[PDB]
Design an enzyme around this catalytic site. Structure first.
Site, mmCIF file in Angstrom:
data_model
loop_
_atom_site.group_PDB
_atom_site.id
_atom_site.type_symbol
_atom_site.label_atom_id
_atom_site.label_comp_id
_atom_site.label_asym_id
_atom_site.label_seq_id
_atom_site.Cartn_x
_atom_site.Cartn_y
_atom_site.Cartn_z
ATOM 1 N N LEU A 22 0.781 -1.232 0.000
ATOM 2 C CA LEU A 22 0.000 0.000 0.000
ATOM 3 C C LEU A 22 0.816 1.287 0.000
ATOM 4 O O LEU A 22 1.731 1.586 0.797
ATOM 5 C CB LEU A 22 -0.954 -0.166 1.162
ATOM 6 C CG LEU A 22 -2.402 -0.513 1.346
ATOM 7 C CD1 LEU A 22 -2.947 -1.689 0.611
ATOM 8 C CD2 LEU A 22 -2.594 -0.872 2.842
ATOM 9 N N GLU A 30 -10.282 2.289 7.772
ATOM 10 C CA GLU A 30 -10.495 2.113 6.330
ATOM 11 C C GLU A 30 -10.566 0.618 6.004
ATOM 12 O O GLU A 30 -11.267 0.189 5.133
ATOM 13 C CB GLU A 30 -9.474 2.874 5.492
ATOM 14 C CG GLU A 30 -9.819 3.131 4.019
ATOM 15 C CD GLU A 30 -9.709 2.038 3.043
ATOM 16 O OE1 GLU A 30 -8.616 1.443 2.978
ATOM 17 O OE2 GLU A 30 -10.563 1.643 2.266
#
Ligand SMILES: NC(=O)C1=CN([C@@H]2O[C@H](COP(=O)(O)OP(=O)(O)OC[C@H]3O[C@@H](n4cnc5c(N)ncnc54)[C@H](OP(=O)(O)O)[C@@H]3O)[C@@H](O)[C@H]2O)C=CC1
Ligand SMILES: Nc1nc(N)c2nc(CNc3ccc(C(=O)N[C@@H](CCCNC(=O)c4ccccc4C(=O)O)C(=O)O)cc3)cnc2n1
Length: 186
Positions: A22, A30
């Protein structure tokens, strides 16, 4: 059943990945949301199906593999057998869905979620149909190597409000993000 839902997290720079990971520090609310949408099924008896690529499967700790409460489905044009812990292998998005339709995937399959990556969101969109884009807008830059395929967006509707989706800008770990959902029936 359910419609082609796409779920992606985007950085302002349009980045979704970086060296099999990521573009940003992992953001737990999230994650909880991501978990929320993709697992959660109303039909009883049925699971959702999450369609994902080789490099996305692998980013996901072994530990949470296969994702708890969703049929896990992997797209690769190189393995022979599907990655271990992972429930299906499908050489392409046209057959991923054929399979759904196939005999046993039939009664079980409730919605189908596109967790990504790139060519998967790439196959998706370019489908004539009921597609909702669940877009998480990370409102910062992160250097990334992998990006979001751009969507001709004059072809989507930005629903102001979605069932169960936070509509105001969220701030976790000094990062600030907002959820928007897109539609299209083309
Ligand atoms: N932040 C977010 O919201 C998201 C982040 N990510 C991240 O972004 C990056 C993902 O890298 P990316 O290159 O996009 O890789 P993907 O993980 O999407 O690639 C899956 C692999 O599967 C194959 N594949 C992909 N699309 C298809 C298709 N349509 N038919 C057949 N095979 C397909 C390709 O491999 P083969 O050679 O097997 O065909 C690709 O290598 C990582 O950083 C990952 O963590 C991913 C999704 C969402
Ligand atoms: N919108 C959105 N869309 C996407 N496609 C998306 N794709 C990715 C792709 N790369 C990964 C990496 C890991 C996982 C994963 O591991 N999955 C768990 C989540 C549990 C939460 N785990 C935690 O973060 C956590 C860890 C410790 C304590 C609390 C928490 C928490 O969630 O609060 C699950 O079951 O879905 C999934 C995708 C990342 N982000 C995304 N965002």
């Amino acid at each position: 059943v359910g419609s082609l839902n796409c779920i992606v997290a985007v950085s302002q720079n349009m980045g979704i990945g970086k060296n099999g990971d990521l573009p940003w520090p992992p953001l737990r609310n999230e994650f909880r949301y991501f978990q929320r949408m993709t697992t959660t099924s109303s039909v009883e008896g049925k699971q959702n199906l999450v369609i994902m690529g080789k490099k996305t499967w692998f980013s996901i700790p072994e530990k949470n593999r296969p994702l708890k409460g969703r049929i896990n489905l992997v797209l690769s044009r190189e393995l022979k057998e599907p990655p271990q812990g992972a429930h299906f292998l499908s050489r392409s998005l046209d057959d991923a869905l054929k399979l759904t339709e196939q005999p046993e995937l039939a009664n079980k399959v409730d919605m189908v979620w596109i967790v990504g990556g790139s060519s998967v969101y790439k196959e998706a969109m370019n489908h004539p149909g009921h597609l909702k884009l669940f877009v998480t807008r990370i409102m910062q830059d992160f250097e990334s190597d992998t990006f979001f395929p751009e969507i001709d967006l004059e072809k989507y509707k930005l629903l102001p409000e979605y069932p169960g989706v936070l509509s105001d800008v969220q701030e976790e770990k000094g990062i600030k993000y907002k959820f928007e959902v897109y539609e299209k029936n083309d």
